[PDB]
Design a protein around this ligand. Sequence first.
Ligand SMILES: CCCCCCCCCCCCCCCCCC(=O)O[C@@H](COC(=O)CCCCCCCCCCCCCCC)COP(=O)(O)OC[C@H](O)CO
Lengths: 55, 12, 173, 122, 459, 275, 172, 86, 81, 156, 128, 64
Amino acid sequence: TGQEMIISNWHWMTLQTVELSLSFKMDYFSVMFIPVALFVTWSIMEFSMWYMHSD
Amino acid sequence: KRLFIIKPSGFY
Amino acid sequence: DSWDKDVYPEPPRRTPAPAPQTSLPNPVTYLTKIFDLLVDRPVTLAREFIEQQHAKNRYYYYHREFRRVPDITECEEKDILCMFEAEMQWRRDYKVDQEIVNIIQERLKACQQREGESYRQNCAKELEQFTQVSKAFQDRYSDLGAHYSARKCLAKQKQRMLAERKAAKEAAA
Amino acid sequence: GAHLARRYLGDASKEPDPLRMPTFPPDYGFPERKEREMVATQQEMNDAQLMLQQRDYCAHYLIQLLKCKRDSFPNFLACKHEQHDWDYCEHLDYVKRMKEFERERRLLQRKKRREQREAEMA
Amino acid sequence: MLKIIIPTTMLLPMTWMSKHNMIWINATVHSLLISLISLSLLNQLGENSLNFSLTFFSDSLSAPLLVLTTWLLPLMLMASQSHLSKETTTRKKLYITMLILLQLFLIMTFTATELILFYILFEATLVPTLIIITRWGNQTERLNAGLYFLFYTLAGSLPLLVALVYIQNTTGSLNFLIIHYWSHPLSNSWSNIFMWLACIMAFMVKMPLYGLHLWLPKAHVEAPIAGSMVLAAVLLKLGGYGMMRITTILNPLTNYMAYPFLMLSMWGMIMTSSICLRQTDLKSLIAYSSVSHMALVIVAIMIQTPWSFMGATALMIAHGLTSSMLFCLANTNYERVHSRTMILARGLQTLLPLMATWWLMASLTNLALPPSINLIGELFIITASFSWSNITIILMGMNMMITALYSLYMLITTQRGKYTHHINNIKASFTRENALMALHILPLLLLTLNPKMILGPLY
Amino acid sequence: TLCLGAITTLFTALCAITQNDIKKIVAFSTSSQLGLMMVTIGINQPHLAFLHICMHAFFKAMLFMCSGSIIHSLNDEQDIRKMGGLYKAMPFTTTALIIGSLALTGMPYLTGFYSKDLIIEAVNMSYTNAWALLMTLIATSLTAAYSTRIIFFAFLGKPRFPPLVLINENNPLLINSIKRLLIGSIFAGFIISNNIPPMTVPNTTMPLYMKMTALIVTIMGFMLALELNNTTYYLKFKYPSQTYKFSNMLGYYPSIMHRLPTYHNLSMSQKSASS
Amino acid sequence: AYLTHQQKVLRLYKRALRHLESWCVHRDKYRYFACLMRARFDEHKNEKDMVKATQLLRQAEEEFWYGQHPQPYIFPESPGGTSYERYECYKVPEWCLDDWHPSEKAMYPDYFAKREQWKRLRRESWEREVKQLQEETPPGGPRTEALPPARKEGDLPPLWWHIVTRPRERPM
Amino acid sequence: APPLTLEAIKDRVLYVLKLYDKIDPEKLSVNSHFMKDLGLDSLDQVEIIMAMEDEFGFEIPDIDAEKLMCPQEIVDYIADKKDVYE
Amino acid sequence: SKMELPDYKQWKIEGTPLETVQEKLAARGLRDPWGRNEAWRYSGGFANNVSFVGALLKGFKWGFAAFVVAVGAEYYLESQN
Amino acid sequence: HVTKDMFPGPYPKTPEERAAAAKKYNMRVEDYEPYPDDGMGYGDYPKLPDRSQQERDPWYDWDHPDLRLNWGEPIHWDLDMYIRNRVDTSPTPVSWNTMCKHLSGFVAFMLFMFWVGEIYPSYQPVGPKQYPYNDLYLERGGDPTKEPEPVVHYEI
Amino acid sequence: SFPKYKPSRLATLPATLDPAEYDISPETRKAQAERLAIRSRLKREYLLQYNDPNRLGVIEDPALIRWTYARSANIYPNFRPTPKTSLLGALFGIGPLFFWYYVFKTDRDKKEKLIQEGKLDQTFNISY
Amino acid sequence: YRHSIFAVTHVLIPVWIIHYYLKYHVTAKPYTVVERKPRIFPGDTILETGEVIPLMKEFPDQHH
Ligand SMILES: CCCCCCCCCCCCCCCCCC(=O)O[C@@H](COC(=O)CCCCCCCCCCCCCCC)COP(=O)(O)OC[C@H](O)CO
């Protein structure tokens, strides 16, 4: 579908006119990067068992 | 072959 | 809905009708179908269970109403009791005014994500509405200082009508 | 490009300056021209959420592209003829840009060598 | 406020009336109980201070500071029964009495409504701190430090005395409320400038401000551990607290008569952090770090900006919690090796695995890693200062670079590296040391979730 | 950004090809790649820059992980001048590197093709810094340069490691992890490039002789680098070239800029400041 | 105390070949150029005059400095090597074991009991080893850092505990 | 990796020593103080320890190398440096 | 196990490229002292290396073999469709 | 342990006190050298050549192997610049002046050619990117009330 | 011959290139002979304490203690005010402070001047 | 089974509480979850009114 969305959540503080809140913006850059980073680090995690075995 | 390893006491 | 669209305007959701022409199944549709019977349905079942429990006993609460009091332009000089009443009222209006710009900002940011790459044009009305709010907020409370008070807010004002009255005199020339 | 070689290493009054042109009137040189028309209205690219760069005249060969990608999910192998038509539109819009580039260069020949024609004697 | 002062005062007989070895237990548990009652005051009403009586009042500025002092009181008590246990019953009983007399003055100071009542207890903190530094201080130079500490802050406080009494006879009342509501524009007359200097210098000395800061490297290096933290964790903030409170009548003379202090502070932070890049002594390293962080607050206060004030109080308390903690780190290693030199004890992560952690996120909190409130404090000051002037970032930004290099440097030298060969008296760390470290870390990171309880009245 | 992207792309790459440590070699390859990312984001090509992020993630992770395989198996030795002849000794490790190396350097329709030469093509027909364009082309050729250095010295040739061999990669953890990333380096280039919606205007009509420069400079760079690498095979002596000294010493940056400013700032804090 | 002329030139030989590793790389090139280095080192054996030898090594060191490899091939288990002191954050000293807990101590009874055996031996050998040290100590303080060995029977060599009970180079 | 011990060390030590061409195969003894038995110039021991090094892959300090002169001596030095306890 | 050590006689100067070194210093006048030690690097199964290009076309034969069958099948079904 | 008199004192004025300081610093009178007292207050602390701990022979066994110091040896006044991880004075294979010349030259050459590249930019013999709807004034951020100025694209 | 290796305060001269170590004079014969003598004296004592079974604490290093004292309080009792120190104090003291005042005051004066005539965009700048 | 109990206690339960949070607590506040407008194209139809955006009009009909 090609929808990009923002998950704003718990309000950290209402900083007068500023509303700093924990908010997870997501778009193409996010949704594309997430599998790529996870795929690589999972493969690295599997390799790290072999290499870092005596530590 | 297994052998002793020195380690600082973590029990405390 | 709890909130209202009058102060949180939501343009109608122009959702499309999915009409695909391809032989192979669309994975997204069925991947949500399992989600419905694995996550969505148990969440709803628990939610309606706790909601009816909440409906069993419904204790209430209300919103405190502060009736208007004479402000600091009516306060006799050095009249501490009256000045104290005005200062509290001005600080009440200060915080609720901060919430006014906060509401506009949230509505301002709402358009930007909603309109996608068409943000620059779709809600040019939204940008100017915030611009007018920001400009008035500049004349209202900006530059007062860390120890701001209604007296200082009067002083900044008294600077302004003095400035524009001279401008009106200069306009008369 | 040949223009780059002849601009800095050669003359300066013949090679086009991309920052400056079009320096000559559009209707000049050739009486009457056709007008670059967009088949869609201003609403189409807005509702299609077309990005600012991808809002050229070529967008009419792109508006149905995204629909085809959606209407044929996932099927990354289709939407090739539609992309082929879009690429061919890029051919037309691009080739239009060098045609005017040669136009101005030829019009820049039209400028000086004539100016020097009535300069050494009249 | 009598729900806090009265139990604190009644705790004084409590310790003296206790048995031989039960003094530490009863004092700790009740002081912790006093801390709990202090948390009852964190709720500040909308725009009004929680005025209790004419004698005492509290607002969102002193509300976090008060509970910091009460929360501190167990921590010195938890950090003292190591070297104090080898002493007679009376002297241990006396030591507890002083800190409780210390906190009692501090509790009264932050809650005082009248600037004179503020003033009396504000200098009165010298008397218990001076004797603590001199009596139980484990060094020789401490005798010079006591003179250096006492005179330096008094040399600024005494001119302050003449300033307040002048305000009382001229303006009228002197309490924190009437001054704010009856505030009048201060002229540019040279007499007003000197009154500005008098009303300000006393508070800058206790911060301290660069140049007028040499009493920290003397006091903190050889103060007793318990006295070291309080002097580092609140007594510096005591000078800070008066800065917001007294800058209600110094307007608009603040704008022009602040440039020398801003230049002294914005340059001092680079210089003082450059001190920290090389210190032979760990405790001196921490003391100078407190100078740099406090110098940030001086910049923060002197701009007199809404955003600046909330960042000031957030950093003020946050620095106190971490600076006190790092001092506990020094005391632990100094206890094992009986020295203060950096390179003498090294590679301590291998020997002590958990202390490697405790010193680790202590350094991160000292580094203003987001979202730790050290960051939410420093970052606010940068934004306020940048609005004041665009070149402030060049200096104040460079501080975070310099602050990083030395902060990890003590982590690299002490914890990491190779264990010292000859050192062999380092036993496993007692659960008291490990617990005391947690009593500092947990409230810090716990409070990160709700900075609104530390952002002060301007929030 | 065009200026910074270009200089990072070449200078680090120039300091790469003269090093004798795979970890240093592959790292400098990243920074040269990171320099390449800053070039494309420079001339209004943000999405394709992010495409380059994904493809670079795939093959560059394998290279280090593949280099991790050889380092540990051959008793934690990292100097490239000592391994030698790993082609038939470790088939999968040698197989992974050549696919990874080719993807990083070119090889159309592989992972690097859907990102790199598109960036090179995009930066070609644009109003860019003429000097910065020259750096990208040279560094693109230099990308193949150190790639040959790794393949030639490590895997090709005669072996040089200590006599007791411990070469082994049969552990399923190493084989499966490499294979999982390997299939990514073959197809993930085609997948997302055909899957993500077109987020940039395409470049279709350019002369043939800069549409191919991306392949040309890499193939060209492949040639002399191989010839210059087997020039070491030539029995004759090799002179200690001065330019070789400059490049092999990391471009002189660490020996000065980590020693001149740190000394002064540390000296200032003691003589001034503290004392 | 003093690296004589022969000691220094051999040190020059060893370092010269190690640098030439990084240059020649391939073994066939190595065995050739090393032989030239060897042959051209053999020629100046009858140099006689020691002054010439200093002059013979005067240009040698700078010539090495001329052709020194900027990235010499240093060995991993050596200073400058990649795996230098890497396997050290695990070799906690032996004396730390005394601070263990009885529950921890009861885990390894046989080793702990044998450690106590080594503990007593050090206690008994100390007086003899310190006495042996002073009985043949040189006048005017120790002149050479080398320590005397165990002369008679039974007595252990002085200053042995830390050398013998040093942590293993591969503790893990 | 299976750790090395004496019979491993000794066999590898006499391995490279035998491979040296000038060393006489029958003259190879673990207790042979080189030059006084096998004619070897002072410039040769400093270069054969490199072969001794490359056999075991750990650098032999020149201070220890000049003292290291016997096939038994190399075996003893290698074992203790690589914490070989058998 | 025991790691039985290979015998000594399998390593001489012949065959290896170290041959070309031998007559060099022999013409110079000296003799190579370490020739036999390095023979194993250039000999045994460790010899007959692969050229640089040879490594790059690894799997070309069966890779191209997978081509012709694949293209032949797709040529047949598409043309007959 | 150590007594008070062994603590560092004032400048050694007479050679006799120079010898006493050298003994106090566990050195001899030959190698002892007080810092040049320009008033900086170095006292009698013996200045030592700028030698980072990296300079010290790693193969030698030290009492403090991490930093390469032995017990009692009078360490440098400037130890913390010259520790193993801090500033290192190791001899580079090439001269520092040459070290600096090539660094500054390459950076200056890179910057200079970058400027001349900007002076004569590279582009294809192609023209403007023709854009419809009077250069999309409306969606560029323009105001609807202010009508766009006449802009049109033609064809040949 | 390649160019020589000139030394620097940051790029030191190696022992292999130093002319001084080339000529080992009989005067230097004993000069570098007591090096081991004093080192062994420090050595033999150090191992004796280090190996001592009775030792439980740390062995105090007089050089370390002296260094801490020298880099500390024992500086002003050796401080003599001279034009070098006096100028150095002013140059690294009042100098930067006034220079920082000049740049900030100049910019701040220019900053408020633009606001005075309304020559700065702060329409959206409301938080301060 | 070891894959099954991993799924339930590390995906099934965590997705349950997150969805419940995202469906009845945080989405109960305005402008908390904002998404891009549903990108429709000329020719298709929309749901909330059942209206058809018109088909793309006659194309200048070019070919390659
Ligand atoms: C270590 C030295 C001090 C450190 C720095 C401390 C702060 C610097 C300034 C110190 C000022 C101390 C005296 C100020 C008293 C209160 C100031 C006040 O209320 O303002 C008056 C400021 O008036 C003054 O004259 C105040 C004193 C000015 C400074 C002269 C004395 C102070 C400096 C010397 C003594 C202190 C230094 C120690 C010396 C050993 C306004 O009164 P007025 O002058 O308008 O009165 C009406 C009419 O004009 C007649 O007075």
